[PDB]
Amino acid sequence: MKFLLTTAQGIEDIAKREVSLLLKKLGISFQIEEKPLGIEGRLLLEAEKAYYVDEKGRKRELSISTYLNENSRLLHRVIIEIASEKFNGIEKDESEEALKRIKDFVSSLPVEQFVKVSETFAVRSFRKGDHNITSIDIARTVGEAIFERLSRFGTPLVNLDHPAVIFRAELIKDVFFLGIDTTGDSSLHKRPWRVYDHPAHLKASIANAMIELAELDGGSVLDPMCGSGTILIELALRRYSGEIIGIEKYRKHLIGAEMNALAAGVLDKIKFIQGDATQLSQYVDSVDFAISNLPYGLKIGKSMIPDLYMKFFNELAKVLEKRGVFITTEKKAIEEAIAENGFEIIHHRVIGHGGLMVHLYVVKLEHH
Ligand SMILES: Nc1ncnc2c1ncn2[C@@H]1O[C@H](C[C@@H](N)CC[C@H](N)C(=O)O)[C@@H](O)[C@H]1O
């Protein structure tokens, strides 16, 4: 059986390792492709069905979708795949030749075997790249064809806001995807603990991607520019055995982070300090790790950020024992701050954070 698993662009390999460790525990055989068909923010999972013997002595299925929904920290959506196809030249086909290609394609799909003729259903679409039709055209064309198809078999029941079964149709570049979205209208990154909403907060999946890349070992972990608290809370909710510390310049944000941590059940295990990271060595003497989503300093200045990174990183030099994991839009400010201060890049990545192409670096001190 086949699942399309989504996550942030540029973290597919991290999401893969995450997915394996999890399914291995079930005993399942499976195989996982990064970026099926070249599309980013995706994994195509192939597994055998997960059977056990139940209380009645009967073969019973274990939901793999449920298992992943419940336990993954990196995934956005778990979708049961019905088909994945390239439509050559679609975004360059004219509006009506496009809807045409779609409907005829979907009309062929045995969609009745994925939904009970008599469950409710909606379509939700995601469209992307340059096309001649809208995202709304897809939900429309795809919806027509599911409804028409299901009719042959009975009485189709449509419900936009409270479906029991969401079909999701994605068209990205020239790749079309149709599937059953098991995750729902709220994507997995939408955390219940997030009661204070930071204007520049880290998407929780990318937070765990930073945690993984750090290769933590029980040593103390610091978010010097913590904000809303995302990175530290994710790490506490992973049950991390080490000290966890967050420093945040602005009180409002820091009290937000404490409220977020209260709502997540982990406020006890994080030490939250109002404080200024360019004076870092006043707040601490030693930390094994530092993990931060740095302020991107949008707009200009005329030179705000270069100077912020330069000081912070000089302070960091003073206290860091193992590794730093950092995220920023400001490629230049960061790499000079890194260079001038005797840090060494041991990993660099590009990631899609919401809609911006962010840089992620892993660093150590040179002389270590
Ligand atoms: N000199 C400084 N020292 C410490 N923190 C700072 C300093 N300058 C800015 N900050 C904070 O850095 C934080 C960076 C945020 N982008 C972090 C978002 C956070 N990762 C979250 O998910 O909620 C901002 O909330 C700023 O208040």
Swiss-Prot record:
Keywords per UniProt: Cytoplasm, Methyltransferase, RNA-binding, S-adenosyl-L-methionine, Transferase, tRNA processing
Q: Where in the cell is it found?
A: Cytoplasm
Query: What positions does the domain THUMP occupy?
Result: 69-182
UniProt xrefs under Gene3D superfamilies:
3.30.2130.30, Vaccinia Virus protein VP39 (3.40.50.150)
Please name the Pfam families in this protein's record: THUMP, UPF0020
The residues that hold S-adenosyl-L-methionine are H198, P199, A200, H201, L202, S228, G229, T230, E248, D276, A277, N293
Known catalysed reaction(s)?
A: guanosine(6) in tRNA + S-adenosyl-L-methionine = N(2)-methylguanosine(6) in tRNA + S-adenosyl-L-homocysteine + H(+)
Recorded superkingdom: Archaea
Q: Name one GO cellular component term.
A: cytoplasm
The record's GO molecular-function terms, alphabetically, read: RNA binding; tRNA (guanine(6)-N2)-methyltransferase activity
**Looking at the keywords, is Cytoplasm present?**
yes
CDD domains from the UniProt entry: AdoMet_MTases, THUMP_AdoMetMT
By its UniProt entry, which SMART domains does this protein fall under? THUMP (SM00981)
Q: Which family does it belong to?
A: Belongs to the methyltransferase superfamily.
Q: How does it assemble?
A: Monomer in solution.
Role, per record: S-adenosyl-L-methionine-dependent methyltransferase that catalyzes the methylation of the guanosine nucleotide at position 6 (m2G6) in tRNA(Phe).
- Domain text: Consists of an N-terminal THUMP domain fused to a catalytic Rossmann-fold MTase (RFM) domain.
Name of protein: tRNA (guanine(6)-N2)-methyltransferase
Question: Which organism does this sequence originate in?
Answer: Pyrococcus furiosus (strain ATCC 43587 / DSM 3638 / JCM 8422 / Vc1)
